[PDB]
Amino acid sequence: SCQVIPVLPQVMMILIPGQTLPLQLFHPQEVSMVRNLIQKDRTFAVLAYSNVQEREAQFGTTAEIYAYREEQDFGIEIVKVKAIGRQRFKVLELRTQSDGIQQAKVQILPECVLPSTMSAVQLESLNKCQIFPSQCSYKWWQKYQKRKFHCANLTSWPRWLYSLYDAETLMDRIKKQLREWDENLKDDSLPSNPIDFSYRVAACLPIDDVLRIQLLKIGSAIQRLRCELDIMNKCTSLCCKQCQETEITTKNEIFSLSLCGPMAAYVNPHGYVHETLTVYKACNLNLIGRPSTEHSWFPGYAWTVAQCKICASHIGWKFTATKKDMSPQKFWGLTRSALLPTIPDTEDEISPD
Amino acid sequence: SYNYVVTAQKPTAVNGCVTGHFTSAEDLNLLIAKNTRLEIYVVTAEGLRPVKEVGMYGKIAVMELFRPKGESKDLLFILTAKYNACILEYKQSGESIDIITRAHGNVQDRIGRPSETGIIGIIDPECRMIGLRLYDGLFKVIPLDRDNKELKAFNIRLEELHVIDVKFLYGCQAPTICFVYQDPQGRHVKTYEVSLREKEFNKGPWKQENVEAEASMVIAVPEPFGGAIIIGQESITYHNGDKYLAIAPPIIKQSTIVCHNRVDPNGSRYLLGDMEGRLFMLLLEKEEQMDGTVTLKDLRVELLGETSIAECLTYLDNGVVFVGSRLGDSQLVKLNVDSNEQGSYVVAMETFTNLGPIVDMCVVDLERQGQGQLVTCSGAFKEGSLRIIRNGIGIHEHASIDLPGIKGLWPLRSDPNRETDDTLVLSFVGQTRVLMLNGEEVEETELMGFVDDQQTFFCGNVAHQQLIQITSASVRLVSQEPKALVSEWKEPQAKNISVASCNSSQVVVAVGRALYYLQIHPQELRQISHTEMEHEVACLDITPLGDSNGLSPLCAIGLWTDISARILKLPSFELLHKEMLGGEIIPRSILMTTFESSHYLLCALGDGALFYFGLNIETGLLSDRKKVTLGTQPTVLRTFRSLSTTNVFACSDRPTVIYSSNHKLVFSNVNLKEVNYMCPLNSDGYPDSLALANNSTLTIGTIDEIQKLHIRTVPLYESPRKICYQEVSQCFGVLSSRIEVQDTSGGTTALRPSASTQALSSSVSSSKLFSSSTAPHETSFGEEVEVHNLLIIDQHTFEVLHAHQFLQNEYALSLVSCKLGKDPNTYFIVGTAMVYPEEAEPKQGRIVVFQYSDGKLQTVAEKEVKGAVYSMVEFNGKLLASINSTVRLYEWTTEKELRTECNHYNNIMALYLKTKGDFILVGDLMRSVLLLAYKPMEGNFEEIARDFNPNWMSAVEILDDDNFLGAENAFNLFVCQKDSEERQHLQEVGLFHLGEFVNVFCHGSLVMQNPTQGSVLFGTVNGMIGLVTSLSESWYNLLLDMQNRLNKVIKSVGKIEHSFWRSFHTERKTEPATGFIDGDLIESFLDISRPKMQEVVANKREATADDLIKVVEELTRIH
Amino acid sequence: GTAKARYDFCARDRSELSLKEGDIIKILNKKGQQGWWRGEIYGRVGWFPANYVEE
C-alpha cells in the first residue's frame, strides 16, 4: 500500500513500532497540525534520518497520536502529546509544502513472519509433541530441545543449530539477559508474540541511531531477535558518541530502579526527549555544579550533570539518595543520544542477521 | 535460466497407511501414502499383491477410508498440503483399472494461521461428516451427503486454540468429538456434539477431565467398550465418564510412544510403536457384567519386539503387520505365538527399500564403468545406512566362450529324467554347432538326428517326450529317449524355409509368401493349414497364452511390402485386426506375451522401433498403440522368468528388459554394450542363468533384480551425517553419531553395537587444544549423549576400516577430501564445533587434517577456531572454511600447517559454501544468498551481489557462474541469475513447487554417457532423488506449451490442475511456476493413448505428433 | 532580534544553550515559563532563562 502521510518538523527520534514518542509543542503551527491528526484519525510519520544535518531519510515508522494534554497556562497554551509507532515504511518522496512541513510519499513495508523451522521439514511427523506447559530449568530445556527439534536429525544440520533460529528459544535467551537487568516477570509485562517481543526489546536497548536504523530495516521478526542478541552479547560496553574511545559503562552494570524497563523515555521542562538508561556505576565522567532535585525524574534521588572526561559532552547525570533508607544509594542516568555501543578489544560493528 | 527437473527415484518414505475394502467389498486392502504417491495393495497369505499406483498432485496430509449409506465398497478421502479435499472411487472394468473423482474442492481459508500440530482430519463412524483442523481455533466440517460435489464446507469458531489430538468418539447418539487440548493451566480432555443443522458445539457426554502433562494421543474406542484412551510419557488413562482407569508401567518410560493401530474390530487389542523402534501390545481386558454390556477390567502393556522406527502401523491379518517407516526401511513383520530366545514375538518377513532421509550424498564412478553411482547418507538412529544407487540392470558374467557370429541360441534337455538343461544349440552362418554342459564344462558335441550343415531358426524340447529342429533345409523331429530322426517335413518344391516359429505343441513355418501349420504328435508332423499371404513374410510367433494352456488359437506375422502386424486363427487363417505400420523398414521380430494378467503384442523393427498393443486372447484384436525406440539395430525378442514373473529381453544396440509393473510396460536397460541374440539357461553348473551372445563372445551369467535402478544397502546402526570420496585410498569418509546413555559409573555405553564401535581400527581424538575448564559437565544418568565420529568405510566391500572418535561435546559438521597446496598427499579435513548444553552459541571449534595411512587415521594438522565450522570446500589448492560469520581462506604451508591467508566478515551465518573457479556462493538458513569472489592479485575476497529475502533454506548449488539453484521454504526450488550498471543484486529467475524437502545438491549423472546443458542430482527427506538439467530457451518455449496442452488431456487425481500444484507457495506468496519444466508431466506424453497425442499436438517448424515423440524420448535418456 | 547576554549560564543538557555575558543571541522563539526562550548564536541552538539575559 501507498499513503502520503505528514511529517512533524521538531521530531529528531528514530521511532520503532510499539515505542512511545513523547512530545511538548510550543509553536502554534505544529499544535494545530497535531489537533487535525486527532479529528481525522490519521497517522503522522517519523523519518529515521541517516544525515540529520541536511534532513535525509530512507526509512521510518507511522506514529498514531494516542494522548493529548492541553495545559492552558499564564504564559502560553503548552501541549504534551504521546504517540505510538505502528507500521514500518520506505521513503519515496519528500514533498515540502509552502507551510514548511513535508508530506512524505510512504510505502508501508510488510511485517514478514515465518513458521516453525521444523514444520517446513515434515507435515505430520512430531506434530503431537511440539508445545508443552511450564523438576528444574536445566532438565526442562534439555528435554524441550530434544523433543521439539527431533526432526532436525532428518536435515543436514544439528538440533542446537535450529535453536539459534527458533523464535521461542531466541525470546527466552533474551528474557534471561533482561531478567539480570530488570526484576520484572514476562507473564504480562513482556509480550508472547515474537513480532511484539522483538520491537519491545528494540525500543528498550541502549543503542545508537545507526543501529536503530539497521534494526528498523530488518523485515523478519526472527532476524530481528537474532540481531538483538548479537548486540547484547558483542557490545558489552557503552562509550561516548563524540570521542569513540571513552568507556563509560558495561552490560553487567545495567539495572531497573523504575519498574518500567531499564531505559525509559523521559522529558525535561524544555520539551526535549532523553531516553535514560539506569546503571549502578559509570566511570570516566566529570560532575558539574551542585546536586539538584528540580523536576527530578527519580524522586528522592538528587541529580548532578555528568559530562565526558575528554570531550566534555553531556552524557547523563549522577543520582544519589538523600535518605539512608533508600536502596541503592547511587546510580547514573545515561542518555541514549550520547552513548555508542562499542565491541571491546579492536573489532568494528558486525552482527549476523 | 530455463531449467528442466525430473524424478530419478520416486519418494520411498511412508507417511500414512490404512486398511479397508477400497477395491472390492471382499478384498482386504492396504493403502500407503508415499508423499506425492498412493499405493494400492491386496492382503494375501503370501503378502501384498500390487494393483494400482497413482500420482497425486499434492503431499498427502490426511488419508482415510469410509463407506456411507448406499455404497457397496469403501471410498477414499484425501486432503493435500495445499488443502485440496477429494473423495476417490476405485472402478475396475475388466483388465483396465481407473481411479475416478466422486467429489473435489479446495478448502483453503481466505485468512488463516496454520496450526502448530499440522493438519488433523477425522471421519465420523456413521460417515455423516469429516472434521478437519487446519488452523488454530477453527474446526471445519464437510457435510457428507450424496449431493455435495464441490465440497463446500463450513468453518466453526472453536474457543480452544492449542488442540493436540482429536478423534470422533464411537458409540454416541449424535456425532461427538473427543480431544486433548493445552492451555496455561494444563493439558485436559474435552468433548463436544457437532450439529450440522445449528453449526455449533453443544455439551458433550462427559465433563472436562485433567490428563498427564506429557499426554499427547487420543484413541476412538469402538463398541462395546466405548470412550477413549489417552497415551502419555509415563501414564495411560481411560475415559468413559464414570470410569477413570490409569496405569504407569515401567516398560514404556524408556521411549515416547508415537503411533497406534487397531487389531480387533471391537478394540480389545492395539499395537503401539515408539521412537526407539519398539512394538507393544495394549490389551483392554473385559469383565463379564451380566447386564449384556461389559466393563473394562484393566489395561495391560506387553513388549512384542524390535521393529523399524515407524511413523504409522497397521495390522493386516494372521499376525502379519505392516510397519510404515519414515527414517528406515518399511517392513512386513509376523507376530508369533512363541517368542525367540531373545524374547521377541516379532519376526521380519519382507523389507521395502527407503533411501530417506537423504542427509548427504556424492557421485562416484565406483567400478570405472563410465556410468556414475550415488552413495547416500540415509536413515537415522538404529536405521542409519549408506545406499549405492545405479541405473540399469547388471549381468554377472561367469562363462566367456569366444565364438564369433552366433545367429540364434536355444536351451535343450537331451535326457528326459533331468529337469535341468544340459545342452545349448548355437546357430551359425550356414551351419549349426551343438554344445554340452557337464557342470561348468562346455564341449562341442553332436546330437543325433540334428543336421549340422544347415542354419537353424528354432530348436527345443516339445510334446510327447520329443525334440524339434527347424533348419533352412527342413523341419526335423527326434525321439528323445532312443535319439533318432522319427519324422521330417520337407517343402514340396525343395525350397528353403525363410521364417519359422514353434511352441510346445505347434509348428508354424513360412516359405516366402506360403505358410504351413503343423502339429506335434508321437513320431509325426502333419500339415493342417496352407495359406498364401499378400507379400513376403517378415517375422512370425506362436507363443501360447493362458486361454487354454496347450495350443495357441492366435498367430502373429509381419509383411515386407505395406508393413503391418496381423493376427490369424490357426485352423483357417482368418485376418483378425490388420494394424498397419508406418515407414520404409520391415519388422525383424514379433512376439505375443502375458504380463501380470493383460496380454500384449510386441513388434520390433530394423530401425530399433518397438510397438506394443493390448491383445484379447478370444477376439484377437489390438488396442492402445504405443511406439518406443530402444536401439538403432534390429531388436530380437525372447522370454525369460528369472524371479517368478515373465519378462522379455530385447537384444539390440541398447539391450533392454521389457517387463511390467503397475499394469503398464517398463523399459529398463541392461548394463551391456551390445547383445545380438540370447536365451534363458538352467544348467547344473549355471543354475537360473542367461546365455547372452554378441558379435564375438558367447557368455553365460546370472541377471540382477529386474527393476529400474539397482540399490545396495549398507547398515551402520547409527546416524550418518556427511560423506566424501578419496580415490587414492579407495574408500569413503563418513561422519556419524551414535547415541550413548550417561552411565552411573561415569562413562558412556551404547544402546546397541554400531559401525563406530564395531570397527577394524579405532582411535580417540586425544588433544588438549580445548582446556578442561570450559563448561561443567552436569549431565545426570540416562541422558542422551551424542558421540560424534568419522568412519573410513571401504569402497568395494563397504567394511568400516577405521572409526576415529572426536572429543567430549565435539560435533563434526563438515568434511572434505582434497590435495592442498603443493603437497602430493590427499587428506580428509573435518570441521568441528564444541557444543556444551549450557552454552547456546558455539564459541569454540577446530579444523583437523587427517591422513589415512597404514590402516590408521593419522592427524597431520589441528587448527583451533573461535567458532563453529559449518562448511568447507577446496578452492584452487587452498582450504576455504566458515567459522560462525567469517569466511576464511587457509594456505597449506611446506611444514604441513594451515596459515590464515585472508578473511571476509559477513553480517550473516555461513552455513552453505559452494565454488566454481574463482567464484564463492555463500548461504544462510534464512535464504541469505551472497556471491563473493577471490581476486588473486588483490589477495582477498570482494562482494559481487546478494539477495537477502527472509525465507527458510535447506540447500544451494552453482549451475554456472551466473545461474544459482537452491531449495527454499514449503518444498520449493528457485534460481538466481547474474546480469553482468546494476550488478550488485541477484535477479530471482525461477520458482517451482517441488513438493519434497531437498537436503543436498550434487553435480553428476547416473548415465553411461558413451540435448540438455548441465546435470545436478538432489536428495530429499522423503527418499526421492531428483535431477535438474538446464535447457535452451527455444526448447523451454516448446516444452512450456506442452505443459499447458498436456494439462487439458491428462485426467488428474482429484481434478487438481497442474498449474496450481507446481506453482510457488509460501503461505504469504503464491506465484505461478516460472523458469522450470515439470519433467514428469512431459514424460507422461508417452503414457497417454495414441488419439490423445493428436489432440495435444494440434498446431520454419511443424508440430507433427511423431516429431514430439522423439523429443520426449530424448529427455528420458538423461536419467 | 539582538538580545544581549548579562550573566553566565552553563547548559545542563544538549537542549540548553551554554552562555557567557556579552554576546547577542538571535531569538527564534520567545515563549515559556520563567522566561525560558529558544535562541541561536549562528551555530549552537538552545534555551535560556530571562533573569540571566536581557533584551
Ligand SMILES: [Zn+2]
Ligand atoms: Zn567523550
